[PDB]
Design an enzyme around this catalytic site. Structure first.
Site, PDB file in Angstrom:
ATOM      1  N   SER A   1       4.215  -3.246  -2.704  1.00 49.73           N
ATOM      2  CA  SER A   1       4.807  -4.453  -2.134  1.00 49.73           C
ATOM      3  C   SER A   1       5.616  -4.015  -0.882  1.00 49.73           C
ATOM      4  O   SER A   1       5.025  -3.364  -0.005  1.00 49.73           O
ATOM      5  CB  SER A   1       5.565  -5.203  -3.239  1.00 49.73           C
ATOM      6  OG  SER A   1       6.048  -6.456  -2.820  1.00 49.73           O
TER       7      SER A   1
ATOM      8  N   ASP B   1      -5.057 -11.296  -4.722  1.00 52.62           N
ATOM      9  CA  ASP B   1      -3.649 -11.504  -4.432  1.00 52.62           C
ATOM     10  C   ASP B   1      -3.525 -12.687  -3.458  1.00 52.62           C
ATOM     11  O   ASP B   1      -4.124 -12.682  -2.404  1.00 52.62           O
ATOM     12  CB  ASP B   1      -3.098 -10.209  -3.870  1.00 52.62           C
ATOM     13  CG  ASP B   1      -1.568 -10.199  -3.721  1.00 52.62           C
ATOM     14  OD1 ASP B   1      -0.873 -11.262  -3.706  1.00 52.62           O
ATOM     15  OD2 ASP B   1      -1.076  -9.075  -3.553  1.00 52.62           O
TER      16      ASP B   1
ATOM     17  N   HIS C   1      -0.766  -9.900  -7.167  1.00 53.18           N
ATOM     18  CA  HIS C   1       0.380  -9.068  -6.754  1.00 53.18           C
ATOM     19  C   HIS C   1       1.137  -8.565  -7.962  1.00 53.18           C
ATOM     20  O   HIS C   1       2.351  -8.754  -8.106  1.00 53.18           O
ATOM     21  CB  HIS C   1       1.308  -9.867  -5.830  1.00 53.18           C
ATOM     22  CG  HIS C   1       2.086  -9.013  -4.907  1.00 53.18           C
ATOM     23  ND1 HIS C   1       1.507  -8.357  -3.842  1.00 53.18           N
ATOM     24  CD2 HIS C   1       3.393  -8.678  -4.897  1.00 53.18           C
ATOM     25  CE1 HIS C   1       2.425  -7.666  -3.204  1.00 53.18           C
ATOM     26  NE2 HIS C   1       3.579  -7.831  -3.834  1.00 53.18           N
TER      27      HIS C   1
HETATM   28  N1  LIG Z   1       5.354  -2.165 -12.950  1.00 48.67           N
HETATM   29  C1  LIG Z   1       5.010  -1.783 -11.574  1.00 48.67           C
HETATM   30  C2  LIG Z   1       3.543  -2.094 -11.313  1.00 48.67           C
HETATM   31  O1  LIG Z   1       2.721  -1.692 -12.122  1.00 48.67           O
HETATM   32  N2  LIG Z   1       3.123  -2.737 -10.186  1.00 48.67           N
HETATM   33  C3  LIG Z   1       1.727  -3.038  -9.842  1.00 48.67           C
HETATM   34  C4  LIG Z   1       1.707  -3.930  -8.634  1.00 48.67           C
HETATM   35  C5  LIG Z   1       0.645  -4.564  -7.973  1.00 48.67           C
HETATM   36  C6  LIG Z   1       0.895  -5.358  -6.850  1.00 48.67           C
HETATM   37  C7  LIG Z   1       2.212  -5.517  -6.409  1.00 48.67           C
HETATM   38  C8  LIG Z   1       3.272  -4.887  -7.070  1.00 48.67           C
HETATM   39  C9  LIG Z   1       3.017  -4.084  -8.185  1.00 48.67           C
HETATM   40  C10 LIG Z   1       3.927  -3.287  -9.081  1.00 48.67           C
HETATM   41  C11 LIG Z   1       5.181  -0.263 -11.375  1.00 48.67           C
HETATM   42  C12 LIG Z   1       6.582   0.299 -11.685  1.00 48.67           C
HETATM   43  C13 LIG Z   1       6.479   1.840 -11.723  1.00 48.67           C
HETATM   44  C14 LIG Z   1       5.704   2.509 -10.551  1.00 48.67           C
HETATM   45  N3  LIG Z   1       5.184   3.813 -11.043  1.00 48.67           N
HETATM   46  C15 LIG Z   1       4.077   4.462 -10.311  1.00 48.67           C
HETATM   47  C16 LIG Z   1       4.142   5.964 -10.523  1.00 48.67           C
HETATM   48  C17 LIG Z   1       5.673   6.110 -10.599  1.00 48.67           C
HETATM   49  C18 LIG Z   1       6.205   4.839 -11.314  1.00 48.67           C
HETATM   50  C19 LIG Z   1       4.546   1.652  -9.986  1.00 48.67           C
HETATM   51  C20 LIG Z   1       4.891   0.176  -9.922  1.00 48.67           C
HETATM   52  N1  LIG Z   2       8.128 -12.943  -1.983  1.00 50.43           N
HETATM   53  C1  LIG Z   2       8.550 -11.555  -2.139  1.00 50.43           C
HETATM   54  C2  LIG Z   2       7.263 -10.767  -2.185  1.00 50.43           C
HETATM   55  O1  LIG Z   2       6.506 -10.894  -3.134  1.00 50.43           O
HETATM   56  N2  LIG Z   2       6.905  -9.964  -1.176  1.00 50.43           N
HETATM   57  C3  LIG Z   2       5.675  -9.185  -1.126  1.00 50.43           C
HETATM   58  C4  LIG Z   2       5.818  -8.190  -0.017  1.00 50.43           C
HETATM   59  C5  LIG Z   2       5.023  -7.123   0.392  1.00 50.43           C
HETATM   60  C6  LIG Z   2       5.400  -6.380   1.508  1.00 50.43           C
HETATM   61  C7  LIG Z   2       6.549  -6.703   2.215  1.00 50.43           C
HETATM   62  C8  LIG Z   2       7.330  -7.771   1.804  1.00 50.43           C
HETATM   63  C9  LIG Z   2       6.961  -8.508   0.698  1.00 50.43           C
HETATM   64  C10 LIG Z   2       7.621  -9.681   0.066  1.00 50.43           C
HETATM   65  C11 LIG Z   2       9.400 -11.290  -3.397  1.00 50.43           C
HETATM   66  C12 LIG Z   2      10.567 -12.267  -3.588  1.00 50.43           C
HETATM   67  C13 LIG Z   2      11.292 -11.930  -4.894  1.00 50.43           C
HETATM   68  C14 LIG Z   2      11.825 -10.484  -4.939  1.00 50.43           C
HETATM   69  N3  LIG Z   2      12.364 -10.189  -6.291  1.00 50.43           N
HETATM   70  C15 LIG Z   2      12.839  -8.797  -6.448  1.00 50.43           C
HETATM   71  C16 LIG Z   2      13.763  -8.741  -7.676  1.00 50.43           C
HETATM   72  C17 LIG Z   2      14.202 -10.215  -7.838  1.00 50.43           C
HETATM   73  C18 LIG Z   2      13.579 -10.959  -6.620  1.00 50.43           C
HETATM   74  C19 LIG Z   2      10.680  -9.524  -4.578  1.00 50.43           C
HETATM   75  C20 LIG Z   2      10.013  -9.897  -3.260  1.00 50.43           C
END
Ligand SMILES: N[C@H](C(=O)N1Cc2ccccc2C1)[C@H]1CC[C@H](N2CCCC2)CC1
Ligand SMILES: N[C@H](C(=O)N1Cc2ccccc2C1)[C@H]1CC[C@H](N2CCCC2)CC1
Ligand SMILES: N[C@H](C(=O)N1Cc2ccccc2C1)[C@H]1CC[C@H](N2CCCC2)CC1
Ligand SMILES: N[C@H](C(=O)N1Cc2ccccc2C1)[C@H]1CC[C@H](N2CCCC2)CC1
Ligand SMILES: N[C@H](C(=O)N1Cc2ccccc2C1)[C@H]1CC[C@H](N2CCCC2)CC1
Ligand SMILES: N[C@H](C(=O)N1Cc2ccccc2C1)[C@H]1CC[C@H](N2CCCC2)CC1
Ligand SMILES: N[C@H](C(=O)N1Cc2ccccc2C1)[C@H]1CC[C@H](N2CCCC2)CC1
Ligand SMILES: N[C@H](C(=O)N1Cc2ccccc2C1)[C@H]1CC[C@H](N2CCCC2)CC1
Ligand SMILES: N[C@H](C(=O)N1Cc2ccccc2C1)[C@H]1CC[C@H](N2CCCC2)CC1
Ligand SMILES: N[C@H](C(=O)N1Cc2ccccc2C1)[C@H]1CC[C@H](N2CCCC2)CC1
Ligand SMILES: N[C@H](C(=O)N1Cc2ccccc2C1)[C@H]1CC[C@H](N2CCCC2)CC1
Ligand SMILES: N[C@H](C(=O)N1Cc2ccccc2C1)[C@H]1CC[C@H](N2CCCC2)CC1
Ligand SMILES: N[C@H](C(=O)N1Cc2ccccc2C1)[C@H]1CC[C@H](N2CCCC2)CC1
Ligand SMILES: N[C@H](C(=O)N1Cc2ccccc2C1)[C@H]1CC[C@H](N2CCCC2)CC1
Lengths: 852, 852
Positions: free
Chosen positions: A709, A787, A819
């Site tokens: 992200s 996504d 996402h």
């Molecule tokens: N719970 C999260 C997840 O699985 N995500 C998937 C995903 C897909 C699209 C957008 C945001 C996300 C976040 C993970 C938390 C731990 C982190 N680990 C990787 C190796 C070290 C620790 C990775 C992200």
């Molecule tokens: N709309 C944002 C998002 O999904 N983004 C995707 C993304 C990928 C690249 C660069 C910027 C962005 C912003 C999310 C809004 C809620 C926020 N939460 C975190 C803990 C509580 C609130 C996370 C970001």
């Protein structure tokens, strides 16, 4: 000089085993801890219990989230520790409510709320009746407990609210004035239903389900994408909490609601999950610099007879247009009613999100919808000029308004005066509590005279504005944190960062004569708390870096000599941690004084079995965007377990909270206004170099960076800006062009694109493809193919330009993901590929050997 | 045993240079050779020239394809070689017609036709008037040369056909009866236009452009996707070649046309090229086992007055439905008119594509369109029962009908008899020429009697069916190959494989008294030829493995003693090869006797600077699907130059034409009926092992495979079936699920999915993801992201299952590409990534070193 440590070079199959093995015993921790607490008094002088608490939880792994209760005793044995028994409220013995089989509407709402829990996600309660109301899967259900009907000693059969509606019903809410009535949303219109009479009535006729969405762009009672994604508002209707009696013996109920028109919002197409269809779904997506939905308030007036039958429904609209009455307002951030129902309230933002206003809206300000132009004038003229909106509070900032859930209205002493608690970062730069009293005077604007109102005409003067809290630390008001006001003792309970930016704690203070802020939670843990409505217990979910999350109940009292002074006593455990996780070594929190003027905090995971005189490859895990703090004194062994895994293989793992992070105040957060992508990597590198000068085991010739992200965004920026430092970058679901991200986020932090041409340019990776490396095995892109938040086109456009630029890339797609990672196999693959990529291109002997 | 040769390990930047350098001098060869020849007699007894030839060509690189002419002299100096001067027909001196800026309709047509040439792609000519007609970009243009107006000695100004039509006009055709009139297609309807009077008239009202395509699914005069993609038919209207005179002094013109209704055809969504829009375009795509378009014939009858003004247009339809008259017909493969205009003809297929029929359709069989039910019956009853369709030829096969462009109708001797030449593989298994005479008798079916016609009722008996050619070799009739009939000398010229399956040659034979087939082209070259309409010259575009393509003109005569015997004399060169390409070593053609009973042919590119006692990594380039032959005696240094590049780096390169390939007859082609994916790799491996036993330089421990389209399909099958043999597989734009490919291709070769459950299963890579390797650096997927033929979902679904199966993959997307590479940078990147992947994962020292 030192010898490089090379990680052991496992095959793909071997790594799959290693990863599976380390997750096997670790399966318990995927289970929601007790939440959504509510305390109800027993009022039984002969009984052993003072209260019954109700909450949502899972009993274990592979089991649904449901309602439980526990019994709070009047007295405890203080020699011992009371473990409260979790008694299930519902009959679920051979009876599942939610399977994983979601509608599109549920799938999307779960993405917006970020919930991965199967079962009941939330509930309503009506204290007068004891009525619980909750959605679970398809159905809307209710049970009674804790009212006049009494207290069950056994699980209750959930009672289905029956329906003739063909499609999923969403967002059920009990009418607080009459708990026989509920409302819900169905195919973007508001319906009501009586749970005794079984009468069911559609209130709004704004959407035809049979029409395709390119024509049929209106909706009622529901929050649009940007509200859900960027403001954490999921509902768009609010019951009036009181009923007006009619002379017939009946009553009038009222629902305030947001009506949205998305007609001029741009339509994108996201790949449909059913990949075999080879189709794409339409979404209304307001990209930066383009139209948000046309919004207004409406009101539904519902006449009920003496025995609960609906007589009539009158749909009402604002006497003058929303854009006239609320000059300059783009977003309805929050709305509700005053406790006695006299006024609806709303918290309203301008498009730039630098102006907040709080507005009271009388129901007298709404008239019936009438197309007939003669009777419409009769209706307009009948509403007196003195009835106007009342802007009870207005605030501005050079940075941005962060919306929060703190707003408490006291009962009215006087008809022309309103008293409330709000929170703001606009006075001092840190979010604090303020008790504000505003004068409700008749406005200089008179409709009769036939003009439009000037901007200042609805502003209420401020009688008093007293700061309840203050200092270089914030009150918490977003993402579950809120306050609890004790109107008897004249105190306010709140969560904050006073003791430390690394720990959340519970505090209490007087709202009338504010001074000493008293901490109720113990130091050395971070706490998420909620307080009994009766203000005599609270519950803390707490952990620290060494110790997994526990949930305990604490009793509150005050000494005889001073009822303002509040103290705490442990009562009972709700959830125990079951020791510390084996084969988990937590990180050390470090900090460094930045050349930017700020202390920055980080986490260091040293390699396990650290040999002296060796230098180890280093991985920087990153988020670094707003609204998130990674570095704090909480247990990281559940969500960030793979950082510990990396450490076990021989990687140094580093995490730094750069400027822009949460919980350091608005100036700190404000560092990247207009400048996203430009500053965060400087902080990351500074922290990295602090560590490297202090610890000779960090091999700076082999640094990697990884994030999702905003983390993926920054991983790309690291590689582009600082290829000298970062050898590999693994970017998950990045934004590569700010012009494709949405209004609510992007304009808050980066302004309008025409007013920040360079910021948008410099912050947009895809405009800068020529700046990437011409060596392969450095850039790996990851993205969920479905996504709808960060469209896959961020990646596809970046690749388009990488290809034109002749630059190499590596790519992995998760075709069943948005996402988030919701399919376990997707996560398994990701983790495996990540470890393998790092091994082959950063950490192993073969990695070093292939670098020409 | 032998020492392994490891390729030199270049950086990505170094490889980019190497590839650029080897393409610099090689830029001339991207230029269309002279084509679309037409000979016109000068008829000037005092002049030096017998003919003027007109043709399409490019003068050089980065220059448009346009009309040229050259002068054929009456006599030549036989001591010397005449190079014909290319005189440009059009005034293009500071005047470009086509830029690269195409409409969607043009983009798609170019994909279907597989043309990458900018400018005029084709033209019409009317010999009576000398009128040329051609589309070039936006415009439709005409010029006159070679008629009564005479012969220009200088370039002509192209004359724009003006229009009031808002959108691109497509498929312009001259009326052969009146060259003042043209027709064209605009927004899926047929229009006509007079190029003298400037009168312009819409004929069909079947499509509204303002409607969105989900409602508006009808079209007229145009071939739908499957016809264009799978049958090489791009037009769906045909002018009647004669005018009926009216008693007023005017005339009647007629256009036969196909009317299509795509309403029940499935809609897919392909990503729109403008990636920033984040949108997707709808396509009607008949997937296997689903509805093709509802088709019928219609006829437009156009009444013109004495001075060329349209009096009236009468839209006519078939007296009974198409499905009744042509029982069992799914596809209109081809259509036209008989030379004198008495009958329209059509070649018609059943859904299984195992039954062809040729049908004559009288214009008397069409009546005016009339909604009014009374006057409709009057119109039906007025058409006599004796007027029926006439099935003049019907043929079946256990394998499939391959559609071709050979069909020649002689002038009618007798009203009740029709004489024609057709080609077929159904009698012998090889495509040969047949002279067929059919009886046009009144059918036993009489409409009046009120029944439906039985299947056999329109079958014409066959008076005679004489084979003109025969043997274990084919006549060529697809993809530009056709015949030329000399009705004076009673001969037929045709291209074929008689001398060799590796060389195409021109032959002549008597159609009346057939025997000795005389070869006109020289052995040692493959030839593509066309013959003057006057049958006294031909042109051959010819090459061989050592020598680039030349184009020469040959004069035909016969000896005094025997006018049947035809001989050839070189006249002049049109295009010279300019030597052999430097730094190109051609491959050797080899062959081997397969255990399948067939001789299989291959090409071997030995490594350059082949050291003795070393063994080299090996790359198998593959197509291996139907309608393609890779191995023949043609110059491969233009289209397959990178095979020579691979050889120069140290790869052995192999190409084998497995069973299913073109030019070996129907039994050979038929080997994979119902069995695609199951047999081709066995042939490839057999050829590979033949080579390996013969040549000790082939390292069988390091074999790679690469292909596009069917080649990519097979590259996946190689890796899945034979991971023991193929170390890496680089699959471009593969089909991974036959259920997602189209009706016309898939059902031809694999039948209906319900009647071949196992074949579809076994042929579908994505159903078999578990069979892929659990080692990385073996599978690389490539795909055009915008591909509307092979949807990207073939790849995305495969990845979906690879991810669930826990299998690794590598992936590259070309976001600006469909089922082709049209952006040079995309090709540059592809070639670079390919060489790099092979280096790092097959050929280099580091590749061998990383294989644990
Ligand atoms: N719970 C999260 C997840 O699985 N995500 C998937 C995903 C897909 C699209 C957008 C945001 C996300 C976040 C993970 C938390 C731990 C982190 N680990 C990787 C190796 C070290 C620790 C990775 C992200
Ligand atoms: N709309 C944002 C998002 O999904 N983004 C995707 C993304 C990928 C690249 C660069 C910027 C962005 C912003 C999310 C809004 C809620 C926020 N939460 C975190 C803990 C509580 C609130 C996370 C970001
Ligand atoms: N699992 C279902 C259930 O428990 N339901 C309760 C319930 C409540 C509200 C609305 C619908 C329903 C259905 C039914 C249990 C009995 C089962 N029989 C068939 C196989 C043997 C037993 C049929 C399904
Ligand atoms: N998921 C529910 C269930 O399984 N329940 C078990 C159960 C046991 C005791 C008391 C209440 C319940 C509810 C019901 C299944 C049938 C479903 N219909 C919606 C339209 C088609 C099917 C409505 C809900
Ligand atoms: N001509 C400028 C440019 O091309 N620059 C290149 C460049 C590179 C690095 C740092 C600064 C710069 C400025 C900018 C082009 C867009 C223009 N807008 C004003 C009206 C709408 C468009 C403002 C200037
Ligand atoms: N010339 C522009 C630029 O350099 N800008 C710098 C700059 C600074 C301040 C304000 C505006 C701007 C725009 C951009 C360069 C990258 C280019 N891509 C399209 C084809 C591939 C690359 C888009 C335009
Ligand atoms: N700072 C890098 C380094 O020392 N690395 C150690 C190492 C070990 C494992 C994986 C990656 C790395 C990177 C070197 C930078 C210059 C580079 N040259 C090669 C061609 C010309 C430029 C060689 C690498
Ligand atoms: N390239 C154009 C052309 O050659 N046309 C011929 C032509 C034929 C049919 C229909 C349209 C047209 C336009 C015109 C040439 C003269 C040019 N001037 C402006 C800059 C200096 C000269 C304007 C464009
Ligand atoms: N591409 C053509 C051209 O450039 N020509 C040069 C030229 C020179 C001599 C004789 C004929 C010609 C044609 C014309 C450009 C203008 C175009 N319009 C279509 C709607 C908007 C613009 C029609 C064709
Ligand atoms: N419709 C086919 C196609 O595009 N396919 C894509 C593809 C990918 C994987 C597996 C099978 C297929 C079939 C093409 C039809 C025309 C044919 N031409 C070759 C030389 C002259 C005729 C090539 C194949
Ligand atoms: N039960 C079979 C199966 O699962 N097989 C596994 C398998 C693996 C290797 C080789 C052969 C086989 C057969 C097939 C399932 C589909 C079925 N159709 C008939 C009606 C419509 C569906 C036919 C049989
Ligand atoms: N069980 C089926 C099978 O084995 N078949 C063999 C067979 C043989 C003859 C005729 C029909 C058939 C179907 C298929 C196995 C792969 C499976 N995928 C879906 C989840 C991931 C994998 C789809 C079904
Ligand atoms: N002209 C073809 C092309 O560029 N294609 C791109 C492409 C994209 C989608 C579907 C089909 C196709 C075919 C290429 C011919 C030569 C071959 N070389 C690679 C290294 C050895 C020789 C590759 C194919
Ligand atoms: N037949 C292969 C071989 O000899 N290769 C030489 C070579 C050189 C360059 C690139 C690829 C190759 C493949 C070997 C097959 C067994 C495999 N084992 C490792 C883990 C257990 C199985 C090792 C490779």
């Amino acid at each position: 000089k030192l010898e490089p440590f090379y990680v052991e070079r496992y095959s793909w199959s071997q790594l799959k085993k290693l990863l599976a093995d380390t997750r096997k015993y670790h399966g318990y921790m995927m289970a929601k801890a007790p939440h959504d607490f509510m305390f109800v008094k027993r009022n039984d002088p002969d009984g052993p219990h003072s209260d019954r608490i109700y909450y949502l939880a899972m009993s274990g792994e592979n089991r649904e989230n449901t309602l439980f209760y526990s019994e709070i005793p009047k007295t405890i044995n203080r020699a011992a520790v009371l473990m409260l028994s979790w008694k299930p409220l519902l009959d679920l013995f051979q009876a599942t409510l939610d399977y994983g089989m979601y509608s599109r509407e549920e799938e999307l709402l779960r993405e917006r709320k970020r919930i991965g829990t199967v079962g009941i996600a939330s509930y309503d309660y009506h204290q007068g009746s004891g009525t619980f109301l909750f959605q679970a899967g398809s159905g809307i259900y209710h049970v009674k407990d804790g009212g006049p009907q009494g207290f069950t000693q056994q699980p209750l059969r959930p009672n289905l609210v029956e329906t003739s509606c063909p499609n999923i019903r969403m967002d059920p809410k009990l009418c607080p004035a009459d708990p026989d009535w509920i409302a819900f949303i169905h195919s973007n219109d508001i319906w009501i239903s009586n749970i005794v009479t079984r009468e069911e009535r559609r209130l709004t006729y704004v959407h035809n389900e049979l029409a395709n969405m390119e024509e049929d762009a209106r909706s009622a009672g529901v929050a649009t994408f940007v509200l859900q994604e960027e403001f954490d508002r999921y509902s768009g209707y609010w019951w009036c909490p009181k009923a007006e009696t009619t002379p017939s013996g009946g009553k009038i109920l009222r629902i305030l609601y947001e009506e949205n028109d998305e007609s001029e919002v741009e339509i994108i197409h996201v790949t449909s999950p059913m990949l075999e269809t080879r189709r794409a779904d339409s979404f209304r997506y307001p990209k930066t610099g383009t139209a948000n939905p046309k919004v207004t308030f409406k009101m539904s007036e519902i006449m009920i007879d003496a025995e609960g039958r609906i007589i009539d429904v009158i749909d009402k609209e604002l006497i003058q247009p929303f854009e006239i009455l609320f000059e300059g307002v783009e977003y309805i951030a929050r709305a509700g009613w005053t406790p006695e129902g006299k006024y609806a309230w709303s918290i309203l933002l301008d498009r730039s999100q630098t102006r907040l206003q709080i507005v009271l809206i009388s129901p007298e300000l709404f008239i019936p919808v009438e197309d007939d132009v003669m009777e419409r004038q009769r209706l307009i003229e009948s509403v007196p000029d003195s009835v106007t909106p009342l802007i009870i509070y207005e605030e501005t900032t050079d940075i941005w308004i962060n919306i929060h859930d703190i707003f408490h209205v006291f009962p009215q002493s006087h008809e022309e005066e309103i008293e409330f608690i709000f929170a703001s970062e606009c006075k001092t730069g840190f979010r604090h509590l303020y008790k504000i009293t505003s004068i409700l005077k008749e406005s200089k604007y008179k409709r009769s005279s036939g003009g439009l109102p000037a901007p200042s005409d609805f502003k209420c003067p401020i009688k008093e504005e007293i700061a309840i809290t203050s200092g270089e630390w914030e009150v918490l008001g977003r993402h579950g944190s809120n306050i609890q006001v004790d109107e008897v003792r004249r105190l306010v309970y709140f969560e904050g960062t006073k003791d430390s930016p690394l720990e959340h704690h519970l505090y209490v203070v007087s709202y009338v004569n504010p001074g000493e802020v008293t901490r109720l939670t113990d130091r050395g843990y971070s706490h998420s708390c909620c307080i009994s409505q009766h203000c005599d217990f609270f519950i803390s979910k707490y952990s620290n870096q060494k110790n997994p999350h526990c949930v305990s109940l604490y009793k509150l009292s005050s000494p005889e000599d001073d009822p303002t002074c509040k103290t705490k006593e442990f009562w009972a455990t709700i959830l125990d941690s079951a020791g510390p996780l084996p084969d988990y070594t937590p990180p050390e929190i470090f900090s460094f004084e930045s050349t930017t003027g700020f202390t920055l905090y980080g986490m260091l995971y040293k390699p396990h079995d650290l040999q002296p005189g060796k230098k180890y490859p280093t991985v920087l895990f990153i988020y670094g965007g707003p609204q998130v703090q990674l570095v704090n004194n909480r247990f990281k062994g559940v969500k960030y377990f793979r950082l510990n895994t990396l450490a076990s293989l021989g990687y140094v793992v580093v995490v730094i909270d750069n400027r822009g992070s949460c919980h350091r105040g608005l100036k700190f957060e404000g560092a990247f206004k207009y400048k996203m992508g430009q500053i965060e990597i400087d902080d990351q590198v500074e922290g990295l170099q602090y560590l490297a000068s202090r610890y000779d085991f960090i091999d700076l010739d082999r640094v990697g960076i990884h994030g999702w992200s905003y983390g993926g965004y920054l991983s790309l920026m690291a590689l582009m800006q600082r290829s000298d430092i970062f050898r590999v970058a693994i970017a998950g679901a990045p934004v590569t062009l700010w012009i494709f991200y949405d209004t609510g986020y992007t304009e808050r932090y980066m302004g309008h694109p025409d007013q920040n041409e360079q910021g948008y340019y410099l912050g947009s990776v895809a405009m800068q493809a020529e700046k990437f490396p011409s060596e392969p095995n450095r850039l790996l892109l990851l993205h969920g193919f479905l996504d709808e938040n960060v469209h896959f086109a961020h990646t596809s456009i970046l690749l388009s330009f990488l290809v034109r630029a002749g630059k190499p890339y590596d790519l992995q797609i998760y075709p069943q993901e948005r996402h988030s990672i919701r399919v376990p196999e997707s996560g398994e693959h990701y983790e495996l590929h990540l470890l393998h990529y790092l091994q082959e291109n950063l950490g192993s002997r073969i990695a070093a050997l292939k670098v020409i």
